Design a protein around this ligand. Structure first.
Ligand code: XDK
Length: 215
């Protein structure tokens, strides 16, 4: 029997779309910082569940292990960043990933137009968008304790989709799947991933594991 699934397609808030076009259509040195931004978000999400768990231990029923997994796939050219953090509710997704204006957007774009390094993106509260430095398309699968699992996706172009995810369940946390541009395949190499994690993400207070598919 044919399965039916509801999708909702949203327009990014005007300045957000503007920022995304800037990131994608300009040359930037040190695009590697995309990984630090994503790992910081996972780190923050892991903190949230950890502190919530002190008042309500049952919030760890969905998995007690607090950590990050990096999974490069040379076959389909994706780099996946997975955490067991707090995850995102539907409202979280709509508010954090596109529809609601961010107070730092205008500031960051002015900063970029003036020649700022993309590395500064994080401080403006829009770090997640650096993913588009290396990915033509980004998929976010997420599960929060009092909500169901969702799939958010965008190849930019001013829109994104949100849907209830019928794919493989994760206990709780967020999985970011970067579908890498053709010339950004170095981020699928084990040596290069270890290099950038070592360089930019050494104060994550949760374990990180890199999984390498046998040659
Ligand atoms: N990894 C993770 N976990 C929870 C939330 C987020 C997130 C994404 C994009 C923007 N703000 C927060 N990322």
């Amino acid at each position: 029997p044919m399965e039916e699934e509801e999708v909702e397609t949203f327009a990014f808030q005007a300045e957000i779309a503007q920022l995304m076009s800037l990131i994608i259509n300009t040359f930037y040195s040190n695009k590697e910082i995309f990984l630090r931004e994503l790992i910081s978000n996972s780190s923050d999400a892991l903190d949230k569940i950890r502190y919530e768990s002190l008042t309500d231990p049952s919030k760890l029923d969905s998995g007690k292990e607090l950590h990050i997994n990096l999974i490069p796939n040379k076959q389909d050219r994706t780099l996946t960043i997975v955490d067991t953090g707090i995850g995102m509710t539907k409202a979280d997704l709509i508010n954090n990933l596109g529809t609601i204006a961010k107070s730092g957007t205008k500031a960051f774009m002015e900063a970029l137009q003036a020649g700022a390094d993309i590395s500064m993106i994080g401080q403006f509260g829009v770090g997640f968008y650096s993913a588009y430095l290396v990915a033509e398309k980004v998929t976010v699968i997420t599960k929060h304790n009092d909500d169901e699992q969702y799939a958010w996706e965008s190849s930019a172009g001013g829109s994104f989709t949100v849907r209830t995810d019928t794919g493989e369940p994760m206990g709780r946390g967020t999985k970011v799947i970067l579908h890498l541009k053709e010339d950004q395949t170095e981020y699928l190499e084990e040596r290069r991933i270890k290099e950038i994690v070592k360089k930019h993400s050494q104060f994550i207070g949760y374990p990180i594991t890199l999984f390498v598919e046998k040659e």
